[PDB]
A paper describes a structure:
Mutations in the human [name] gene cause the neurodevelopmental [name] syndrome. Based on the crystal structures of [name] from Drosophila melanogaster (dmPURA), three conserved sequence regions termed [name] repeats I, II, and III were identified to fold into globular domains. Whereas [name] repeat I and II assemble into an N-terminal [name] domain via intramolecular interactions, two C-terminal [name] repeats III from different molecules interact with each other and thus mediate dimerization of [name]. All these [name] domains belong to the class of the PC4-like protein family, which mainly bind single-stranded nucleic acids and can unwind double-stranded DNA and RNA.
Since Drosophila and human [name] have a rather moderate sequence identity of 46%, we decided to establish a better experimental basis for predicting the structural effects of patient-derived genetic variations and determined the crystal structure of the fragment P215-K280 (i.e. hsPURA III) at 1.7 Å resolution. The structure of the C-terminal [name]-domain possesses the typical four antiparallel β-strands and one α-helix. Like in the previously published dmPURA III structure, the C-terminal [name] domain of hsPURA is built from two [name] repeats III of independent protein chains that interact with each other to form an intermolecular homodimer. Analysis of the crystal structure of the hsPURA III homodimer revealed electrostatic surface potentials favorable for interactions with nucleic acids. When performing gel electrophoresis mobility shift assays (EMSAs) we indeed observed RNA binding. We indeed observed strand separation in presence of the hsPURA III fragment. Since in the [name] F233del variant, one residue is deleted, the orientation of all subsequent amino acids in the β-strand adopt the opposite orientation, likely resulting in a fold disruption of the β-sheet and possibly in impaired dimerization. In the case of the R245P variant, the exchange into proline also likely impairs β-strand folding by introducing a kink, which could also impact dimerization.
Residue numbers in the entry:
A (entry chain B): 213 to 280
B (entry chain A): 213 to 279
Write the structure that this text describes.
């Protein structure tokens, strides 16, 4: 059968904490799992495609607001 | 003790799911709590200030890539 392909996952690592961005797909559509990983701890939220750009804008605006 | 006013918390709502952005401060400094809420489900990650801009860029770059 034909192959579907999603974008490559990426990470952002700080001192002793790592964030993984992983794209997935289900009956509802395409989503982003954002996982936080520490030595004894893994936790994640899932974000539908339709709000990714608004997520991006939200983080950038909060970043600028507190600049510094 | 010394006090600082943080930015106002905001939300993004979709079908049967709500995201909350809440600024906090702990022993590691300022962080963003991102909460995902459903009628009987609530979970969150916490993101230190120093990677907010890179989180923003990551979401925007992935959004554009799906064309
Ligand atoms: Cl594809
Ligand atoms: Cl990843
Ligand atoms: Cl996934
Ligand atoms: Cl899911
Ligand atoms: Cl909020
Ligand atoms: Cl944590």
């Amino acid at each position: 059968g034909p192959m579907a392909e999603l974008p490559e996952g990426t990470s952002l690592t700080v001192d002793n904490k790592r964030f993984f961005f992983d794209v997935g797909s289900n009956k509802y559509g395409v989503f982003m799992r954002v996982s936080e990983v520490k030595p004894t701890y893994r936790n994640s939220i899932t974000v539908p495609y339709k709000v990714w750009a608004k997520f991006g804008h939200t983080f950038c605006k909060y970043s600028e607001e507190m600049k510094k």
